[PDB]
PDB file of C-alpha atoms in Angstrom:
ATOM      1  CA  UNK A  84       0.033   0.068  -0.013  1.00  0.00           C
ATOM      2  CA  UNK A  85       3.052   2.215  -0.654  1.00  0.00           C
ATOM      3  CA  UNK A  86       5.950   2.970  -3.088  1.00  0.00           C
ATOM      4  CA  UNK A  87       9.233   2.247  -1.498  1.00  0.00           C
ATOM      5  CA  UNK A  88      12.068   4.471  -2.866  1.00  0.00           C
ATOM      6  CA  UNK A  89      15.832   4.529  -2.140  1.00  0.00           C
ATOM      7  CA  UNK A  90      17.727   7.861  -2.705  1.00  0.00           C
ATOM      8  CA  UNK A  91      21.546   8.344  -2.616  1.00  0.00           C
ATOM      9  CA  UNK A  92      22.922  11.730  -1.398  1.00  0.00           C
ATOM     10  CA  UNK A  93      26.777  12.356  -1.957  1.00  0.00           C
ATOM     11  CA  UNK A  94      27.523  15.318   0.336  1.00  0.00           C
ATOM     12  CA  UNK A  95      30.739  16.426  -1.341  1.00  0.00           C
ATOM     13  CA  UNK A  96      28.435  16.587  -4.598  1.00  0.00           C
ATOM     14  CA  UNK A  97      25.966  18.687  -2.717  1.00  0.00           C
ATOM     15  CA  UNK A  98      28.525  21.035  -1.186  1.00  0.00           C
ATOM     16  CA  UNK A  99      30.195  21.560  -4.693  1.00  0.00           C
ATOM     17  CA  UNK A 100      26.906  22.361  -6.294  1.00  0.00           C
ATOM     18  CA  UNK A 101      25.791  25.152  -3.985  1.00  0.00           C
ATOM     19  CA  UNK A 102      24.864  28.379  -5.815  1.00  0.00           C
ATOM     20  CA  UNK A 103      27.284  31.313  -5.702  1.00  0.00           C
ATOM     21  CA  UNK A 104      26.852  33.571  -2.758  1.00  0.00           C
ATOM     22  CA  UNK A 105      25.945  30.318  -0.855  1.00  0.00           C
ATOM     23  CA  UNK A 106      29.750  29.344  -0.718  1.00  0.00           C
ATOM     24  CA  UNK A 107      30.285  26.267  -2.786  1.00  0.00           C
ATOM     25  CA  UNK A 108      33.301  24.368  -1.406  1.00  0.00           C
ATOM     26  CA  UNK A 109      34.992  20.907  -1.648  1.00  0.00           C
ATOM     27  CA  UNK A 110      34.294  18.597   1.224  1.00  0.00           C
ATOM     28  CA  UNK A 111      37.681  16.913   1.081  1.00  0.00           C
ATOM     29  CA  UNK A 112      39.627  20.231   0.879  1.00  0.00           C
ATOM     30  CA  UNK A 113      37.645  21.921   3.586  1.00  0.00           C
ATOM     31  CA  UNK A 114      37.609  19.157   6.200  1.00  0.00           C
ATOM     32  CA  UNK A 115      41.429  19.106   6.541  1.00  0.00           C
ATOM     33  CA  UNK A 116      41.374  22.953   6.706  1.00  0.00           C
ATOM     34  CA  UNK A 117      38.977  23.001   9.439  1.00  0.00           C
ATOM     35  CA  UNK A 118      40.763  20.089  11.257  1.00  0.00           C
ATOM     36  CA  UNK A 119      44.087  21.593  11.105  1.00  0.00           C
ATOM     37  CA  UNK A 120      43.197  24.979  12.318  1.00  0.00           C
ATOM     38  CA  UNK A 121      41.025  25.422  15.443  1.00  0.00           C
ATOM     39  CA  UNK A 122      37.677  26.592  14.028  1.00  0.00           C
ATOM     40  CA  UNK A 123      36.035  27.909  10.790  1.00  0.00           C
ATOM     41  CA  UNK A 124      33.026  27.410   8.447  1.00  0.00           C
ATOM     42  CA  UNK A 125      32.364  26.295   4.778  1.00  0.00           C
ATOM     43  CA  UNK A 126      29.171  27.431   3.205  1.00  0.00           C
ATOM     44  CA  UNK A 127      26.328  29.012   5.072  1.00  0.00           C
ATOM     45  CA  UNK A 128      22.712  28.346   6.034  1.00  0.00           C
ATOM     46  CA  UNK A 129      22.001  24.527   6.846  1.00  0.00           C
ATOM     47  CA  UNK A 130      24.472  23.318   4.044  1.00  0.00           C
ATOM     48  CA  UNK A 131      27.309  24.406   6.231  1.00  0.00           C
ATOM     49  CA  UNK A 132      30.383  22.529   7.646  1.00  0.00           C
ATOM     50  CA  UNK A 133      31.534  24.051  10.987  1.00  0.00           C
ATOM     51  CA  UNK A 134      32.050  23.049  14.727  1.00  0.00           C
ATOM     52  CA  UNK A 135      29.517  22.687  17.403  1.00  0.00           C
ATOM     53  CA  UNK A 136      28.419  25.841  19.241  1.00  0.00           C
ATOM     54  CA  UNK A 137      27.532  24.385  22.626  1.00  0.00           C
ATOM     55  CA  UNK A 138      29.334  22.811  25.401  1.00  0.00           C
ATOM     56  CA  UNK A 139      31.088  19.421  24.913  1.00  0.00           C
ATOM     57  CA  UNK A 140      30.859  19.675  21.102  1.00  0.00           C
ATOM     58  CA  UNK A 141      33.243  22.589  20.533  1.00  0.00           C
ATOM     59  CA  UNK A 142      35.809  19.901  19.330  1.00  0.00           C
ATOM     60  CA  UNK A 143      33.081  18.376  16.922  1.00  0.00           C
ATOM     61  CA  UNK A 144      33.312  18.731  13.265  1.00  0.00           C
ATOM     62  CA  UNK A 145      29.595  18.928  12.190  1.00  0.00           C
ATOM     63  CA  UNK A 146      28.705  18.494   8.363  1.00  0.00           C
ATOM     64  CA  UNK A 147      25.206  19.668   8.090  1.00  0.00           C
ATOM     65  CA  UNK A 148      22.956  19.514   5.085  1.00  0.00           C
ATOM     66  CA  UNK A 149      19.474  20.875   4.349  1.00  0.00           C
ATOM     67  CA  UNK A 150      16.735  18.548   3.166  1.00  0.00           C
ATOM     68  CA  UNK A 151      14.619  21.133   0.819  1.00  0.00           C
ATOM     69  CA  UNK A 152      17.933  21.857  -0.992  1.00  0.00           C
ATOM     70  CA  UNK A 153      18.249  18.186  -2.105  1.00  0.00           C
ATOM     71  CA  UNK A 154      15.001  18.544  -4.070  1.00  0.00           C
ATOM     72  CA  UNK A 155      14.147  14.910  -3.558  1.00  0.00           C
ATOM     73  CA  UNK A 156      10.426  15.806  -4.361  1.00  0.00           C
ATOM     74  CA  UNK A 157      11.479  16.629  -7.955  1.00  0.00           C
ATOM     75  CA  UNK A 158      12.650  13.030  -8.615  1.00  0.00           C
ATOM     76  CA  UNK A 159       9.187  11.784  -9.101  1.00  0.00           C
ATOM     77  CA  UNK A 160       5.958  13.467 -10.314  1.00  0.00           C
ATOM     78  CA  UNK A 161       3.434  14.721  -7.913  1.00  0.00           C
ATOM     79  CA  UNK A 162       0.726  12.558  -9.404  1.00  0.00           C
ATOM     80  CA  UNK A 163       2.096   9.479  -7.552  1.00  0.00           C
ATOM     81  CA  UNK A 164       1.650  10.701  -4.048  1.00  0.00           C
ATOM     82  CA  UNK A 165       1.991  14.214  -2.321  1.00  0.00           C
ATOM     83  CA  UNK A 166       3.119  12.282   0.926  1.00  0.00           C
ATOM     84  CA  UNK A 167       6.914  11.504   0.969  1.00  0.00           C
ATOM     85  CA  UNK A 168       8.152  10.259   4.332  1.00  0.00           C
ATOM     86  CA  UNK A 169      11.632   9.046   5.225  1.00  0.00           C
ATOM     87  CA  UNK A 170      11.726   5.337   6.215  1.00  0.00           C
ATOM     88  CA  UNK A 171      15.529   4.758   6.845  1.00  0.00           C
ATOM     89  CA  UNK A 172      18.722   6.758   6.523  1.00  0.00           C
ATOM     90  CA  UNK A 173      22.197   4.925   6.445  1.00  0.00           C
ATOM     91  CA  UNK A 174      25.537   6.635   6.082  1.00  0.00           C
ATOM     92  CA  UNK A 175      28.662   5.457   4.065  1.00  0.00           C
ATOM     93  CA  UNK A 176      32.094   6.910   4.359  1.00  0.00           C
ATOM     94  CA  UNK A 177      33.883   5.666   1.182  1.00  0.00           C
ATOM     95  CA  UNK A 178      37.229   3.984   1.662  1.00  0.00           C
ATOM     96  CA  UNK A 179      38.011   5.684   5.032  1.00  0.00           C
ATOM     97  CA  UNK A 180      38.279   2.782   7.523  1.00  0.00           C
ATOM     98  CA  UNK A 181      40.157  -0.497   7.537  1.00  0.00           C
ATOM     99  CA  UNK A 182      38.683  -3.730   8.788  1.00  0.00           C
ATOM    100  CA  UNK A 183      39.620  -3.076  12.481  1.00  0.00           C
ATOM    101  CA  UNK A 184      39.204   0.587  12.667  1.00  0.00           C
ATOM    102  CA  UNK A 185      36.246   2.803  13.819  1.00  0.00           C
ATOM    103  CA  UNK A 186      34.565   6.103  13.185  1.00  0.00           C
ATOM    104  CA  UNK A 187      32.612   7.966  15.734  1.00  0.00           C
ATOM    105  CA  UNK A 188      29.870  10.031  14.146  1.00  0.00           C
ATOM    106  CA  UNK A 189      26.184  11.092  15.239  1.00  0.00           C
ATOM    107  CA  UNK A 190      23.629  11.739  12.483  1.00  0.00           C
ATOM    108  CA  UNK A 191      21.000  13.820  14.030  1.00  0.00           C
ATOM    109  CA  UNK A 192      18.007  15.979  13.002  1.00  0.00           C
ATOM    110  CA  UNK A 193      16.271  19.122  14.259  1.00  0.00           C
ATOM    111  CA  UNK A 194      14.271   8.483  20.966  1.00  0.00           C
ATOM    112  CA  UNK A 195      14.438   8.054  17.129  1.00  0.00           C
ATOM    113  CA  UNK A 196      16.151  11.240  16.128  1.00  0.00           C
ATOM    114  CA  UNK A 197      19.770  10.300  16.192  1.00  0.00           C
ATOM    115  CA  UNK A 198      22.204   7.539  14.904  1.00  0.00           C
ATOM    116  CA  UNK A 199      25.616   6.551  15.799  1.00  0.00           C
ATOM    117  CA  UNK A 200      27.938   5.690  12.867  1.00  0.00           C
ATOM    118  CA  UNK A 201      30.411   3.101  13.634  1.00  0.00           C
ATOM    119  CA  UNK A 202      31.992   1.462  10.564  1.00  0.00           C
ATOM    120  CA  UNK A 203      30.557   3.643   7.743  1.00  0.00           C
ATOM    121  CA  UNK A 204      29.843   0.906   5.254  1.00  0.00           C
ATOM    122  CA  UNK A 205      26.142   1.068   4.507  1.00  0.00           C
ATOM    123  CA  UNK A 206      26.032   1.649   8.148  1.00  0.00           C
ATOM    124  CA  UNK A 207      22.833   2.279   9.942  1.00  0.00           C
ATOM    125  CA  UNK A 208      22.693   2.902  13.693  1.00  0.00           C
ATOM    126  CA  UNK A 209      21.465  -0.638  14.617  1.00  0.00           C
ATOM    127  CA  UNK A 210      23.259  -3.899  15.304  1.00  0.00           C
ATOM    128  CA  UNK A 211      20.390  -5.477  13.211  1.00  0.00           C
ATOM    129  CA  UNK A 212      18.217  -3.325  10.966  1.00  0.00           C
ATOM    130  CA  UNK A 213      14.954  -5.043  10.756  1.00  0.00           C
ATOM    131  CA  UNK A 214      11.846  -3.656   9.056  1.00  0.00           C
ATOM    132  CA  UNK A 215       9.774  -5.809  11.418  1.00  0.00           C
ATOM    133  CA  UNK A 216       9.708   2.262  14.821  1.00  0.00           C
ATOM    134  CA  UNK A 217      12.340   4.181  12.979  1.00  0.00           C
ATOM    135  CA  UNK A 218      11.557   7.774  11.526  1.00  0.00           C
ATOM    136  CA  UNK A 219       7.807   8.193  11.741  1.00  0.00           C
ATOM    137  CA  UNK A 220       7.126  11.980  11.008  1.00  0.00           C
ATOM    138  CA  UNK A 221       9.976  13.023   8.937  1.00  0.00           C
ATOM    139  CA  UNK A 222       9.297  14.602   5.655  1.00  0.00           C
ATOM    140  CA  UNK A 223      11.912  14.901   2.889  1.00  0.00           C
ATOM    141  CA  UNK A 224      11.480  18.479   2.156  1.00  0.00           C
ATOM    142  CA  UNK A 225      11.777  20.100   5.624  1.00  0.00           C
ATOM    143  CA  UNK A 226      14.416  20.057   8.241  1.00  0.00           C
ATOM    144  CA  UNK A 227      18.281  19.728   8.256  1.00  0.00           C
ATOM    145  CA  UNK A 228      20.338  16.625   8.866  1.00  0.00           C
ATOM    146  CA  UNK A 229      23.778  16.925  10.466  1.00  0.00           C
ATOM    147  CA  UNK A 230      26.586  14.584  10.943  1.00  0.00           C
ATOM    148  CA  UNK A 231      28.946  15.190  13.933  1.00  0.00           C
ATOM    149  CA  UNK A 232      32.488  13.903  14.055  1.00  0.00           C
ATOM    150  CA  UNK A 233      33.717  14.315  17.741  1.00  0.00           C
ATOM    151  CA  UNK A 234      37.368  15.031  18.831  1.00  0.00           C
ATOM    152  CA  UNK A 235      37.916  16.283  15.250  1.00  0.00           C
ATOM    153  CA  UNK A 236      40.179  19.157  16.184  1.00  0.00           C
ATOM    154  CA  UNK A 237      43.969  18.835  15.739  1.00  0.00           C
ATOM    155  CA  UNK A 238      45.028  21.715  17.992  1.00  0.00           C
ATOM    156  CA  UNK A 239      43.213  20.229  20.732  1.00  0.00           C
ATOM    157  CA  UNK A 240      44.948  16.865  19.927  1.00  0.00           C
ATOM    158  CA  UNK A 241      41.858  14.567  19.399  1.00  0.00           C
ATOM    159  CA  UNK A 242      41.619  11.216  17.834  1.00  0.00           C
ATOM    160  CA  UNK A 243      40.167  11.214  14.336  1.00  0.00           C
ATOM    161  CA  UNK A 244      42.044  14.517  13.657  1.00  0.00           C
ATOM    162  CA  UNK A 245      44.353  12.545  11.198  1.00  0.00           C
ATOM    163  CA  UNK A 246      41.692  10.238  10.154  1.00  0.00           C
ATOM    164  CA  UNK A 247      39.231  12.973   9.005  1.00  0.00           C
ATOM    165  CA  UNK A 248      41.996  14.481   6.707  1.00  0.00           C
ATOM    166  CA  UNK A 249      41.870  11.187   4.781  1.00  0.00           C
ATOM    167  CA  UNK A 250      38.148  11.482   4.063  1.00  0.00           C
ATOM    168  CA  UNK A 251      36.765  11.235   0.436  1.00  0.00           C
ATOM    169  CA  UNK A 252      33.020  11.840   0.725  1.00  0.00           C
ATOM    170  CA  UNK A 253      30.059  11.402   2.990  1.00  0.00           C
ATOM    171  CA  UNK A 254      27.151   9.331   1.416  1.00  0.00           C
ATOM    172  CA  UNK A 255      23.722   9.230   2.802  1.00  0.00           C
ATOM    173  CA  UNK A 256      21.304   6.397   1.745  1.00  0.00           C
ATOM    174  CA  UNK A 257      17.889   8.032   2.287  1.00  0.00           C
ATOM    175  CA  UNK A 258      15.015   5.549   1.848  1.00  0.00           C
ATOM    176  CA  UNK A 259      11.399   7.011   1.762  1.00  0.00           C
ATOM    177  CA  UNK A 260       7.986   6.047   0.759  1.00  0.00           C
ATOM    178  CA  UNK A 261       5.438   7.636  -1.540  1.00  0.00           C
ATOM    179  CA  UNK A 262       1.997   6.978  -0.171  1.00  0.00           C
TER     180      UNK A 262
ATOM    181  CA  UNK B 158      67.949 -23.033 -17.227  1.00  0.00           C
ATOM    182  CA  UNK B 159      71.103 -23.845 -19.410  1.00  0.00           C
ATOM    183  CA  UNK B 160      72.493 -20.829 -20.955  1.00  0.00           C
ATOM    184  CA  UNK B 161      74.993 -20.830 -23.874  1.00  0.00           C
ATOM    185  CA  UNK B 162      77.982 -18.973 -22.418  1.00  0.00           C
ATOM    186  CA  UNK B 163      81.021 -19.645 -24.948  1.00  0.00           C
ATOM    187  CA  UNK B 164      81.199 -20.475 -28.502  1.00  0.00           C
ATOM    188  CA  UNK B 165      84.706 -21.289 -30.000  1.00  0.00           C
ATOM    189  CA  UNK B 166      85.881 -22.295 -33.533  1.00  0.00           C
ATOM    190  CA  UNK B 167      88.732 -24.786 -33.506  1.00  0.00           C
ATOM    191  CA  UNK B 168      90.836 -26.193 -36.397  1.00  0.00           C
ATOM    192  CA  UNK B 169      93.019 -29.322 -36.036  1.00  0.00           C
ATOM    193  CA  UNK B 170      96.233 -29.851 -37.668  1.00  0.00           C
ATOM    194  CA  UNK B 171      97.420 -33.076 -38.697  1.00  0.00           C
ATOM    195  CA  UNK B 172     100.531 -33.044 -36.601  1.00  0.00           C
ATOM    196  CA  UNK B 173      98.249 -33.440 -33.496  1.00  0.00           C
ATOM    197  CA  UNK B 174      98.082 -29.663 -32.731  1.00  0.00           C
ATOM    198  CA  UNK B 175      95.069 -27.262 -32.586  1.00  0.00           C
ATOM    199  CA  UNK B 176      94.531 -23.841 -34.484  1.00  0.00           C
ATOM    200  CA  UNK B 177      91.879 -22.082 -32.355  1.00  0.00           C
ATOM    201  CA  UNK B 178      90.216 -18.738 -32.384  1.00  0.00           C
ATOM    202  CA  UNK B 179      89.504 -16.738 -29.344  1.00  0.00           C
ATOM    203  CA  UNK B 180      86.038 -17.863 -28.007  1.00  0.00           C
ATOM    204  CA  UNK B 181      82.804 -15.535 -28.217  1.00  0.00           C
ATOM    205  CA  UNK B 182      81.723 -15.710 -24.758  1.00  0.00           C
ATOM    206  CA  UNK B 183      78.251 -14.462 -23.600  1.00  0.00           C
ATOM    207  CA  UNK B 184      76.928 -13.364 -19.881  1.00  0.00           C
ATOM    208  CA  UNK B 185      73.419 -13.540 -18.758  1.00  0.00           C
ATOM    209  CA  UNK B 186      71.618 -11.575 -15.990  1.00  0.00           C
ATOM    210  CA  UNK B 187      71.770 -13.810 -12.714  1.00  0.00           C
ATOM    211  CA  UNK B 188      68.913 -14.791 -10.366  1.00  0.00           C
ATOM    212  CA  UNK B 189      70.380 -14.762  -7.004  1.00  0.00           C
ATOM    213  CA  UNK B 190      67.464 -14.086  -4.730  1.00  0.00           C
ATOM    214  CA  UNK B 191      69.058 -15.253  -1.526  1.00  0.00           C
ATOM    215  CA  UNK B 192      71.515 -12.471  -1.480  1.00  0.00           C
ATOM    216  CA  UNK B 193      69.601  -9.471  -3.322  1.00  0.00           C
ATOM    217  CA  UNK B 194      66.401  -9.840  -1.328  1.00  0.00           C
ATOM    218  CA  UNK B 195      65.559  -6.291  -0.245  1.00  0.00           C
ATOM    219  CA  UNK B 196      62.580  -5.512   2.024  1.00  0.00           C
ATOM    220  CA  UNK B 197      60.962  -2.169   1.683  1.00  0.00           C
ATOM    221  CA  UNK B 198      58.183  -0.543   3.623  1.00  0.00           C
ATOM    222  CA  UNK B 199      54.938   0.237   1.476  1.00  0.00           C
ATOM    223  CA  UNK B 200      53.128   3.279   2.937  1.00  0.00           C
ATOM    224  CA  UNK B 201      51.778   3.985  -0.752  1.00  0.00           C
ATOM    225  CA  UNK B 202      48.987   1.558  -0.286  1.00  0.00           C
ATOM    226  CA  UNK B 203      47.218   3.202   2.806  1.00  0.00           C
ATOM    227  CA  UNK B 204      44.064   1.223   3.907  1.00  0.00           C
ATOM    228  CA  UNK B 205      44.556  -1.545   1.226  1.00  0.00           C
ATOM    229  CA  UNK B 206      42.777  -4.605   2.487  1.00  0.00           C
ATOM    230  CA  UNK B 207      41.693  -7.898   1.062  1.00  0.00           C
ATOM    231  CA  UNK B 208      39.091  -8.245   3.680  1.00  0.00           C
ATOM    232  CA  UNK B 209      37.085  -5.249   2.186  1.00  0.00           C
ATOM    233  CA  UNK B 210      36.501  -4.577  -1.387  1.00  0.00           C
ATOM    234  CA  UNK B 211      40.193  -3.599  -2.531  1.00  0.00           C
ATOM    235  CA  UNK B 212      41.920  -5.160  -5.562  1.00  0.00           C
ATOM    236  CA  UNK B 213      45.370  -4.894  -7.039  1.00  0.00           C
ATOM    237  CA  UNK B 214      44.456  -4.932 -10.737  1.00  0.00           C
ATOM    238  CA  UNK B 215      44.725  -2.841 -13.711  1.00  0.00           C
ATOM    239  CA  UNK B 216      41.846  -1.132 -15.417  1.00  0.00           C
ATOM    240  CA  UNK B 217      42.259   1.136 -18.333  1.00  0.00           C
ATOM    241  CA  UNK B 218      44.644  -1.650 -19.894  1.00  0.00           C
ATOM    242  CA  UNK B 219      47.951   0.029 -19.147  1.00  0.00           C
ATOM    243  CA  UNK B 220      49.966  -2.983 -18.082  1.00  0.00           C
ATOM    244  CA  UNK B 221      50.687  -2.094 -14.555  1.00  0.00           C
ATOM    245  CA  UNK B 222      48.358  -2.690 -11.544  1.00  0.00           C
ATOM    246  CA  UNK B 223      46.340   0.023 -10.025  1.00  0.00           C
ATOM    247  CA  UNK B 224      44.424   0.124  -6.821  1.00  0.00           C
ATOM    248  CA  UNK B 225      40.581  -0.341  -7.003  1.00  0.00           C
ATOM    249  CA  UNK B 226      38.097   0.155  -4.449  1.00  0.00           C
ATOM    250  CA  UNK B 227      34.517  -0.432  -5.274  1.00  0.00           C
ATOM    251  CA  UNK B 228      31.447   0.507  -3.172  1.00  0.00           C
ATOM    252  CA  UNK B 229      28.020  -0.629  -4.482  1.00  0.00           C
ATOM    253  CA  UNK B 230      27.434   2.943  -5.823  1.00  0.00           C
ATOM    254  CA  UNK B 231      30.849   4.377  -6.953  1.00  0.00           C
ATOM    255  CA  UNK B 232      34.305   3.013  -7.704  1.00  0.00           C
ATOM    256  CA  UNK B 233      37.378   4.729  -6.535  1.00  0.00           C
ATOM    257  CA  UNK B 234      40.678   4.001  -8.539  1.00  0.00           C
ATOM    258  CA  UNK B 235      44.613   4.683  -8.161  1.00  0.00           C
ATOM    259  CA  UNK B 236      46.305   4.638 -11.426  1.00  0.00           C
ATOM    260  CA  UNK B 237      50.025   3.853 -11.266  1.00  0.00           C
ATOM    261  CA  UNK B 238      52.219   6.872 -12.169  1.00  0.00           C
ATOM    262  CA  UNK B 239      55.832   8.094 -12.107  1.00  0.00           C
ATOM    263  CA  UNK B 240      57.533   9.602  -9.204  1.00  0.00           C
ATOM    264  CA  UNK B 241      59.151  12.621 -10.422  1.00  0.00           C
ATOM    265  CA  UNK B 242      61.651  12.786  -7.693  1.00  0.00           C
ATOM    266  CA  UNK B 243      64.840  10.758  -7.846  1.00  0.00           C
ATOM    267  CA  UNK B 244      65.070   7.586  -9.948  1.00  0.00           C
TER     268      UNK B 244
END
């Protein structure tokens, strides 16, 4: 009684394809800029790459993306269904980790609102992903979805400061329905 | 392998002597891997792994193996090239 659709979002492709005056940038060349120095920003709005503002997240590199700027609602005609809700989001960090290495990353949204990345290879949060209540209420055209890498500052000498410099992309595997 | 290392033309006189030319002698590149075996660190191949989806093979033809990582959506390649530095 639904139309189950998968969508892939490459965040380096999204950040490079921002309009001018919205600050397009390379994700691979602006992560090791922000990791090397203390703080900074990359782009503006919700498609920005910066550090966390609050306490205990000052050393956390947050790569945020907007949902309406992805324009997922244009992938299919509106005649199929005007309701388009997220079913499941998984993260892939391509070629980053070995077989015995780990990444710490939190994929949140502004319970079932956050997600911890561990291996980054079609990685959901869960130890077993069963479709047998993840993400009821989340529309594809509103909100922002950020990914926080803790300890990602090299002047504070955190782990994953050297590891995030060898980062190629950030891939999000959004699954959604068209009911 | 047997390698032909010396060719010589010899004539024999009837008074039991030898008329000989100086020999054409040939030398071959040796395989002495017990002495010349050198170990070198390989930091070029960072995060290469046969447990994950990496491969030493050559796409693009080109005769020298590259490094291919393949996800289910995109493929990442490292073509072999020339160091401009020293040798």
